[PDB]
Write a protein that binds this ligand. Structure first.
Ligand SMILES: [Zn+2]
Ligand SMILES: [Zn+2]
Lengths: 114, 192, 138, 48, 48, 8, 426, 244, 103
């Protein structure tokens, strides 16, 4: 799935089929280094590109004065009442008016979507 | 703007539309076509929906949830755990494996919602892909009852064995690069 | 034991002048620099003009080993200074100002495409054929 | 209120945010008039 | 137009160039008249 | 300045 | 200690204090004031010292062959606005008299010029011409250098000037002219826009300038080519990122630009471009551009690739390489750095530009708005007159150089006073 | 003016408080020629060197070892362009910068500092072109402006207290458009800061008076909120033509 | 053994050195005399699971500086010297980095 680099020149490896043993390899084009492929998957494309934006949401966002917050939804970890909520804030998000929540109070940063 | 929304279709009006008509522009801003239905399909909504599906362009990208390319050394190996069953079924009486099989596997996964909205069939999609591309692309299609709609595409068996090509034994576009080119072509140009 | 509450305090010495100037040699972590194989090295001013205000070239273990290029730090430390503390038998720390900072980056000991052939290859941007075979041909 | 609805009447008097939004609308109308003149003039000349 | 269960008589497009290439110059005469009348009378304005 | 269907 | 429901008095008291200190035209005035002092000195300092020697071919021998003449402009001075009558006696010029007589309200500008001459005998001689008059600068009325400044309303009435007149205008040829602040796009800022009909899906632009010392802008584009174009390899690779570097005829692949900055390894280029290696989407985005630049794997080859596409070709290969290197050090990303080892900083900023383009393509950041007035700056009297004075002072130095070169090729001598043409600046 | 695109002419939201909405010419220059608001000020420019020195003292390690690291080092400190390093703590840096802006040591009133919490960038712009306006400062739900300041300003003459003293005290602050994007404003202290059904409890600033959003010519219009918007533009144009 | 040879003996002995960033007032105080051989004292106090580093300014020099450590795992640093006799040598490898802050 991910990209891995050569251990000699730190260039980009490329996948290559081993014709003898039928085992996927990654070889650097600029040298002779070769490493067997462990993942066995190469090119993955998510056309719907459904990605949980909780991975793209920063905990620091809880410090923004311009964001709305409610005391209705408490946090799961610490049970803090304040929770600052906001929409996708992303282009090409398809159609999503879902509210994402970020817990206020220091260092918790727990994020839930309801 | 401020056009009354009788239908969910925008139309150029006013000075720009007068410009388009007067200039006889080859490219209208909003080219539209009003279609009237001849038979009972006009009265009945389901037949009208069938006509709408027959008249609306649908690419493979529109119904494809996600596409992946796995290097599968053997068809029986079944690197993906899920296909192990249905691959076995198709290889209980294997077809077109006599020449060879491709070591690379394009495991397209289609969204059921889009498929049922467009009323497409796995056999329909597989037939379109296999026939249009030819014997080179061999496709294995899941049962609709299975939770995941999976189409397993492989490159030409005779091209893999290289007995049919003869000529010089030199890889053209490798195989995975060629498979990626095929994937892009299917995504944007299938015209199912 | 004493290690859980040891307190060490040492004298600091700053000599006015040192015969050898002190510099900083910094290697990137991903390069995995190892000094065990450094049997010999050659550090000299570059000849790319084909002196004191020019980058440095390092050639470890002659031509067979890896080569590195080091460039002085462009940002001067007008409001900062760097010192190095070294252990000495007298037990007092000695501080030496950093004359220069150098970041060394390696160059692979791999076959290098000639400029003319590289231009000819770039003329064929749409390299339908495998690039690895092209590199093997060169 | 946030997106531009003005509940006050002209007699009652617009609140400051409503005032700015109203200015935005009036600006759009004025721009439309000014841009319209030239395109319509060119069309009329072509037809004649 | 040639699709099944599509009325050949009344199916029309707004593009006058397509009307030309498919149905002929007289069909374009009528279609251009229809399109101009639509844009003119959408405001409710009447032109003879 | 009125609404979406009116004027600005 | 609060002021509730008494607020209507308080807001207008603080507004009254604001308008009592400043007034309405404080933009113009302040801008001009700043300009004069800072800008003129800076420009006079920033212009290269005049270097000059006689042609070696003209005279035989090397005893006096390089008579190096070096001219340095030390310091600036402005007198109060002054009119020089036909008799020649200087007089203070009141604005009202300038309006009536159709004169220009301007002040003389004097520069200390130090001329150092090396006769190749190592006896370099430095002669300082103090207060050398180089031109006249129109003075904005009621600015710090206007005669009306710091005068009470009674004194203004004695001079037939209105106490209520705001100032902020120049009297040129007896007419009041007002510099109108000119809107412009902000400099040294990366903005990612999308052009619908362009061959690029997204373009990231940075109108870089080095504190407006010179070169008003040096714009550089990093744009991701659209995948709309269909081809076998084109479909396989997808969108590729190209760079429209200044002073280069055509597009340059971005990875080649990174390698020209000395970062050959793909891992390091991606470290500058992709700050988090763990994210797979951005790595997949960057892969095709690496594929495009797989040919060039050396710094010198990349420099030659850049030089070949330069606007003016270089016959020699190493000439092309040196030209590309100097062009990158000066023209590309001038605000980041202009000399020495600013290459790492330029690499980091170019990686930031590519990264911001990638974020816009992935939808993680929104495209910038050109109409957003945060992305806009306003050129007041200061920046406009500063640009003017840059141009005219460079032309003045050029004319001094021409006159000096003639007289030096003669070998007779050179006079600073004759070389300076006050006509130019004035 | 020839361009018929209706995009660059429209009154943008960011023009609030810095360009008069009403006062624009009508014709080929609708929305292309603008006029400053009454309280608007335009930055004159300053040297970025002291700000860079303070940043170096606080932290902002430059030439680091790929430390952004999914922006683990929260925020990248920018200046007028010129990425100058990054910090691990962005909030302490922002608060220290605001305190310095009050004490007027390294940050003149015009220095504009913007932190984008998402995307993790701090911009710190001092580039001689920015248009900014004075806003009162709200700490918790209380305006920093108090009766002492208003009483001293009321006695302005023979008390040697002026607007610059109000700025030095930290009561008011200059905010440009980029900072206006990151600031919670209240139109009025009483109506908005005071506790009610809580719309926002994080107001950071308060408008001195809304009427200052108008320019010179539109400020003579009486009851301008009771007229149609194009009529205020017409009155600005005609008030430039009145005889007096 | 040549002119360009680098004396890697310090690397072989694995001599550990500490790199510290110190302010300009401290460096200028040191450079004022710079020849007395003394500028201050570095005191390190270690506890069960915490260590603190401080520097005390010399009383003559003045007429507390806590040290904050930084991780060095992200970059490998070494110190090399260019002798006036054109004999390059390596002094050691940096094993710890510190910053000096005003009180
Ligand atoms: Zn390699
Ligand atoms: Zn929590």
């Amino acid at each position: 799935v991910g990209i891995r680099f050569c251990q000699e020149c730190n260039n980009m490896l490329y996948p290559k089929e081993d014709k003898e043993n039928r085992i996927l390899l990654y070889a650097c084009r600029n040298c002779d280094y070769q490493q067997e492929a462990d993942n066995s998957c190469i090119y993955v494309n998510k056309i719907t590109h459904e990605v949980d934006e909780l991975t793209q949401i920063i905990a620091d966002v809880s410090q923004d004065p311009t964001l709305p917050r409610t005391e209705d939804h408490p946090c799961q970890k610490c049970g803090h009442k304040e929770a600052v909520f906001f929409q996708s804030h992303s282009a090409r998000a398809e159609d999503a008016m879902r509210l994402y929540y970020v817990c206020t109070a220091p260092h918790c940063g727990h994020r839930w979507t309801e | 703007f401020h056009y009354a929304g009788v239908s969910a279709k925008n139309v150029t009006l006013g000075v720009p539309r007068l410009k388009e008509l007067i200039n006889i522009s080859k490219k209208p801003k909003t080219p539209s076509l009003t279609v009237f239905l001849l038979g009972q399909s006009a009265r009945d909504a389901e037949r009208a929906k069938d006509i709408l599906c027959r008249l609306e362009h649908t690419t493979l990208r529109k119904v494809t949830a996600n596409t992946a390319i796995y290097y599968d050394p053997n068809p029986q190996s079944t690197v993906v755990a899920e296909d192990q069953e249905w691959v076995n079924v198709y290889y209980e009486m294997p077809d077109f494996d006599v020449a060879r099989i491709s070591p690379w596997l394009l495991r397209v996964e289609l969204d059921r919602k889009h498929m049922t909205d467009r009323k497409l069939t796995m056999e329909q999609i597989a037939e379109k892909i296999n026939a249009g591309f030819g014997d080179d692309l061999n496709c294995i299609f899941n049962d609709d009852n299975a939770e995941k709609l999976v189409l397993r595409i492989r490159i030409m068996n005779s091209d893999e064995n290289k007995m049919q090509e003869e000529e010089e034994v030199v890889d053209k576009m490798d195989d995975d690069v060629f498979l990626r080119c095929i994937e892009s072509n299917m995504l944007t140009d299938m015209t199912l | 034991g004493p290690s859980s509450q040891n307190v060490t305090e040492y004298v600091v010495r700053v000599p006015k002048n040192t015969t050898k100037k002190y510099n900083i040699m910094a290697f990137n972590a991903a390069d995995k620099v190892n000094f065990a194989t450094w049997n010999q090295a050659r550090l000299e001013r570059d000849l790319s003009n084909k002196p004191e205000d020019q980058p440095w070239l390092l050639r470890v273990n002659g031509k067979s080993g890896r080569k590195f290029k080091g460039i002085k730090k462009g940002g001067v430390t007008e409001n900062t200074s760097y010192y190095i503390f070294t252990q000495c038998p007298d037990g007092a720390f000695e501080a030496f100002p950093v004359h220069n900072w150098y970041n060394f980056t390696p160059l692979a000991r791999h076959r290098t495409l000639t400029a003319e052939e590289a231009e000819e290859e770039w003329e064929r941007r749409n390299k339908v054929l495998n690039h690895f075979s092209i590199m093997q041909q060169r | 209120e946030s997106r531009g609805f003005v509940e006050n009447s002209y007699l009652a008097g617009l609140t400051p945010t409503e005032f700015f939004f109203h200015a935005m609308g009036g600006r759009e109308g004025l721009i439309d008039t000014a841009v319209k003149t030239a395109e319509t003039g060119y069309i009329q000349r072509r037809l004649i | 137009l040639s699709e099944k269960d599509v009325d050949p008589v009344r199916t029309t497009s707004n593009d006058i160039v397509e009307i030309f290439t498919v149905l002929g110059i007289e069909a374009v005469r009528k279609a251009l008249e229809r399109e101009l009348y639509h844009v003119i009378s959408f405001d409710g304005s009447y032109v003879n | 300045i009125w609404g979406i269907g009116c004027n600005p | 200690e609060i002021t509730p429901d008494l607020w209507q008095e308080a807001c207008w008291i603080v507004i009254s204090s604001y308008f009592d200190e400043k007034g309405l035209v404080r933009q113009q005035l302040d801008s001009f004031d700043e300009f004069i002092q800072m800008s003129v000195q800076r420009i006079v300092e920033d212009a290269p010292p005049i270097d000059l020697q006689a042609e070696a071919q003209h005279a035989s021998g090397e005893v006096e062959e390089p008579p190096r003449y070096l001219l340095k402009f030390e310091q600036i001075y402005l007198s109060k606005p002054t009119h020089w009558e036909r008799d020649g006696a200087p007089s203070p010029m009141m604005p009202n008299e300038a309006r009536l007589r159709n004169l220009t309200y301007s002040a003389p500008l004097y520069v200390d010029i130090t001329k150092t001459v090396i006769k190749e005998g190592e006896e370099q001689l430095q002669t300082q011409h103090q207060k050398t008059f180089i031109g006249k600068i129109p003075i904005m009325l009621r600015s710090t250098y206007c005669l009306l400044n710091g005068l009470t309303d009674r004194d203004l009435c004695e001079l037939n000037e209105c106490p209520l007149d705001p100032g902020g205008y120049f009297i040129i040829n007896g007419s009041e002219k007002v510099l109108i602040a000119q809107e412009k796009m902000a400099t040294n800022t990366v903005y990612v826009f999308a052009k619908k009909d362009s061959k690029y899906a997204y373009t990231g632009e940075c109108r870089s300038c080095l504190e407006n010392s010179s070169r008003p802008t040096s714009t550089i584009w990093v744009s991701m080519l659209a995948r709309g174009g269909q081809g076998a390899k084109k479909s396989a690779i997808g969108q590729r990122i190209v760079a429209t570097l200044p002073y280069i005829k055509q597009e340059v692949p971005i990875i080649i630009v990174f390698r020209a900055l000395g970062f050959v390894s793909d891992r390091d280029i991606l470290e500058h471009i992709i700050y988090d290696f763990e994210d797979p989407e951005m790595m997949e985005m960057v892969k095709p551009s690496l594929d495009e630049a797989f040919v060039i794997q050396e710094q010198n080859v990349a420099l030659n690739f850049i030089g070949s596409r330069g606007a003016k070709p270089g016959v020699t290969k190493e000439k092309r390489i040196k030209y590309a290197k100097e062009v990158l050090q000066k023209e590309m990303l001038p605000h980041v750095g202009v000399s020495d080892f600013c290459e790492t900083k330029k690499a980091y900023f170019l990686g930031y530009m590519v990264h911001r383009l990638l974020l816009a393509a992935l939808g993680r950041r929104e495209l910038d708005d050109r109409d957003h007035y945060g992305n806009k700056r306003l050129d007041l009297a200061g920046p406009l007159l500063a640009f003017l004075f840059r141009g005219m002072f460079k032309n003045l130095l050029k004319e001094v150089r021409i006159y000096a070169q003639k007289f030096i090729d003669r070998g007779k001598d050179f006079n600073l006073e004759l070389a300076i043409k006050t006509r130019i600046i004035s | 003016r020839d361009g018929k695109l209706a995009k660059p002419r429209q009154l943008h939201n960011t023009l609030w408080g810095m360009v008069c909405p009403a006062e624009t010419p009508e014709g080929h220059a609708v929305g292309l020629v603008k006029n400053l608001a009454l309280m608007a000020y335009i930055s004159v420019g300053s040297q970025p060197s002291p700000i860079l020195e303070f940043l170096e003292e606080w932290s902002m390690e430059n030439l680091e070892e790929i430390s952004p690291a999914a922006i683990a080092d929260a925020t990248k400190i920018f200046v007028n362009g010129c990425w100058v390093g990054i910090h691990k703590d962005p909030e302490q840096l922002m608060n220290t910068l605001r305190k310095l802006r009050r004490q007027m040591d390294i940050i003149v009133s015009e220095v504009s500092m913007i932190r984008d919490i998402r995307e993790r960038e701090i911009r710190i712009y001092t580039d001689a072109g920015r248009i900014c306006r004075p806003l009162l400062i709200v700490e918790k739900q209380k305006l920093l402006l108090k009766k002492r300041h208003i009483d001293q300003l009321k006695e302005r003459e023979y008390n040697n207290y002026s607007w610059q003293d109000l700025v030095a005290s930290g009561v008011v602050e200059y905010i440009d458009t980029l900072e206006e994007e990151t600031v919670m404003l209240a139109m009025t202290p009483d109506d908005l800061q005071e506790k009610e059904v809580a719309y926002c409890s994080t107001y950071t600033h308060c408008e001195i008076h809304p009427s200052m959003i108008l320019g010179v010519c539109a400020s003579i219009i009486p009851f301008p909120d009771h007229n149609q918007s194009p009529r205020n533009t017409y009155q600005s144009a005609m008030g430039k033509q009145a005889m007096g | 053994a040549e002119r360009g040879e680098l004396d890697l003996t310090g690397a072989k002995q694995n001599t550990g050195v500490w790199l510290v960033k110190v302010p300009k007032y401290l460096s200028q105080q040191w450079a004022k005399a710079s020849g007395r051989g003394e500028v201050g004292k570095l005191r390190i106090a270690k506890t069960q699971g915490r260590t603190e580093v401080s520097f005390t300014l010399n009383e003559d020099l003045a007429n507390e500086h806590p040290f904050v450590l930084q991780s060095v795992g992200g970059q490998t640093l070494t110190v090399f010297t260019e002798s006036s006799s054109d004999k390059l040598s390596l002094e050691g490898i940096v094993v710890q980095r510190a910053e000096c802050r005003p009180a």
